[PDB]
Amino acid sequence: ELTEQGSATIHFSTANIHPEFRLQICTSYVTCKGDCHPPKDHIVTHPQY
Amino acid sequence: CTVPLAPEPMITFGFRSVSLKLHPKNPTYLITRQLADEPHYTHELISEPAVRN
Amino acid sequence: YEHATTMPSQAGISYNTIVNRAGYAPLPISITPTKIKLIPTVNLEYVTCH
């Protein structure tokens, strides 16, 4: 849900150590750029997303 | 029928590895298999304290 | 998470540090030594007097 001048927070999942993707939001494309880090667990109890 | 219940295994995690300390009260089957096209299953009867990596 | 550090052997003075896991929040660790003994293995042989 969008307000007029607010800021929308999304959650995503990746395998990229330097992820960079164009985020489509309803008309337009915004670029999301960052640096991901290794997680803390070796073996988890749910499959891959 | 009431069936017994073995002690909780002590799971130690590593990079692409699971270790299992297994202290059974009475002999107990450990049945493992991989969730891939080759399951490589392992039907074993463990009666003593044993570590399985 | 195995974290190794080193503390100087001096009482009274607080020793501070943090642990920076690469994608998480920093975890602060504080150790203040109070009283540092040194007890040898002591073996009585004899006593004497007047």
UniProtKB/Swiss-Prot annotation, chain C:
On assembly, the entry states: Interacts with spike glycoprotein E2. The precursor of protein E3/E2 and E1 form a heterodimer shortly after synthesis. Processing of the precursor of protein E3/E2 into E2 and E3 results in a heterodimer of the spike glycoproteins E2 and E1. Spike at virion surface are constituted of three E2-E1 heterodimers. After target cell attachment and endocytosis, E1 change conformation to form homotrimers. Interacts with 6K protein. Interacts (via fusion peptide loop) with host LDLRAD3 (via domain LDL-receptor class A 1); this interaction mediates viral entry to the host cell.
Where in the cell does this protein reside?
Virion membrane; Host cell membrane
Name this protein carries in UniProt: Spike glycoprotein E1
Annotated membrane topology is:
Single-pass type I membrane protein
The task this protein performs is described as: Class II viral fusion protein. Fusion activity is inactive as long as E1 is bound to E2 in mature virion. After virus attachment to cell receptor LDLRAD3 and endocytosis, acidification of the endosome induce dissociation of E1/E2 heterodimer and concomitant trimerization of the E1 subunits. This E1 trimer is fusion active, and promotes release of viral nucleocapsid in cytoplasm after endosome and viral membrane fusion. Efficient fusion requires the presence of cholesterol and sphingolipid in the target membrane.
Q: How is it modified after translation?
A: N-glycosylated.
Full-protein interval shown: 813 to 862 of 1254
